[PDB]
Design goal:
Keywords: Disulfide bond, Glycosidase, Hydrolase, Pyrrolidone carboxylic acid, Secreted, Signal. It is found in: Secreted. By secondary structure, the protein is mainly beta. It has a single domain, classed as Jelly Rolls. It has one helix and 16 strands. It has a 16-stranded mixed β-sheet that branches. The two termini are 12 Å apart. 38% of the residues are buried. The structure holds calcium ion. Calcium ion binds next to strand 16.
Length: 213
């Protein structure tokens, strides 16, 4: 696994992170990941872009850690994109492609309503832990700090240092990579709203911190 770190996103660290490029996840992810869709701003931010190179085709950005991370506090200072039919995320993930069980822990912002955040996690591919929380502000407007404390017997999620949600049942056990992506869905209209093709759209990440357990 990796040790504690802080990245201020003043520049793109290619020994530490890697960009998805040249393929689509398939199913609900109605886009092709492109390296060019992950970029660094002159303000010290990582920006993920949803862009359209041709009619009804969408390019998106996903960035992942090279190392894998285990128990402890994950914090992201970010602001999601705002639009029907999209998600901006910050999550941990390992699964069958990595020779392990599907273990994942999510903070997801459904673009159809950026005044709510969704929490979730999967343990050995079993999911359905969705919890939707009212933020009391519009996440798309300004940076906020979002976090999860992943322990052996519980996950605790925070918004600006305040506890919002706690899970205790069927908790993930396999270290995963730290990931962020922004994408437009198809086939999941009830969850995300339909996507209406509007672009470009951006999600911005000021910084990421992990603190080992
Ligand atoms: Ca920064």
């Amino acid at each position: 696994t990796g040790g504690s770190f802080f990245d201020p996103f003043n520049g793109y660290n290619s020994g530490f992170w890697q960009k998805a490029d040249g393929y689509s996840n398939g199913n609900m992810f109605n886009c092709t990941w492109r390296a060019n869709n992950v970029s660094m701003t002159s303000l010290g931010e990582m920006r993920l872009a949803l862009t359209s190179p041709a009619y009804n085709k969408f390019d998106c950005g996903e960035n992942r850690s090279v190392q894998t991370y285990g128990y402890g506090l994950y914090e992201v200072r970010m602001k999601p994109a705002k639009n029907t039919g999209i998600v901006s995320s910050f999550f941990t993930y390992t699964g069958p492609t990595d020779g392990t069980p599907w273990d994942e822990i999510d903070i997801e912002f459904l673009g159809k309503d950026t005044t709510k955040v969704q929490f979730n996690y999967y343990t050995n591919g079993a999911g359905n832990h969705e919890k939707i929380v009212d933020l009391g502000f519009d996440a798309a407007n300004a940076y906020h700090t979002y976090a999860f404390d992943w322990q052996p017997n519980s996950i605790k999620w925070y918004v600006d240092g305040q506890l919002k949600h706690t899970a205790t049942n069927q908790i993930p056990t396999t270290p995963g990579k730290i990931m962020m992506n922004l994408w437009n869905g198809t086939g999941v209209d009830e969850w995300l709203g339909s996507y209406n093709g509007v672009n470009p759209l951006y999600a911005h990440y000021d910084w990421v911190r992990y603190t080992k357990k």
